[PDB]
Amino acid sequence: ERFDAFICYCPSDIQFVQEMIRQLEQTNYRLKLCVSDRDVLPGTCVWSIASELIEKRCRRMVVVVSDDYLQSKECDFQTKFALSLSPGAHQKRLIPIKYKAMKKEFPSILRFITVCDYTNPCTKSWFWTRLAKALSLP
């Protein structure tokens, strides 16, 4: 089955992903998010379902960036694979998200891609609108 986006995230960010489900799948947006801890089946490889799903079965990939995310090798692999699919962010396939105040730097590999910043109080009002729309484009 195909998806609109593959949510890349660390375990400690699962809960924000749940909010994404509550804000993007369970609303009028009706987006089909691929949450690995929910839709990726067991028995799969953990690097090939970042190469079959992300590449062919998902149009975009929402990275849930955070301090915990930097420390989890799996999501780093999946993000670098994203950038392999579209180095330069030409096809607009990698949506970074900063939903929490970070004590570490933003990944130096995503400096030039526009991040959806929940933390910003004056911008959050458009977050779910910007994200949803972005994930709904062809």
Q: How far is CA 11 from CA 14, 111, 112, 119, in A?
A: 5, 23, 25, 20
β 33-35/58-65 pair status: unpaired
Are 64 and 9 in contact, with CB atoms under 8 Å apart? yes
Residues 50, 18: Cα–Cα separation, whole Å: 20
One-letter amino acid of 74? E
Structure obtained using:
electron diffraction
2 in Cβ contact with 54 (< 8 Å): no
Take residue 24 and report the two structure tokens written for it.
């993007």
Instruction: Give 115's DSSP letter.
Output: P
SS (H, E, C) 7-54: EECCHHHHHHHHHHHHHHHCCCCCCCEEEHHHHCCCCCCCCCCCCCHH
From CA 88, how far away is CA 70, in angstroms rounded? 21
| One-letter amino acid for residue 73 of the chain | K
Backbone torsion region of residue 81, taken as left when φ is above 0, otherwise alpha when ψ lies between -120 and 50, otherwise beta:
alpha
CA distance 26 to 19: 10
For residues 54 and 85, what is the distance between their CA atoms, to the nearest angstrom? Answer: 9
Resolution (A): 2.8
Contact criterion met (CB below 8 Å) for 86 and 28: no
Q: Cα(64)–Cα(18) distance, rounded to whole angstroms?
A: 12
Burial environment of residue 32 by CB neighbours within 10 A (0 to 12, 13 to 18, 19 or more): middle
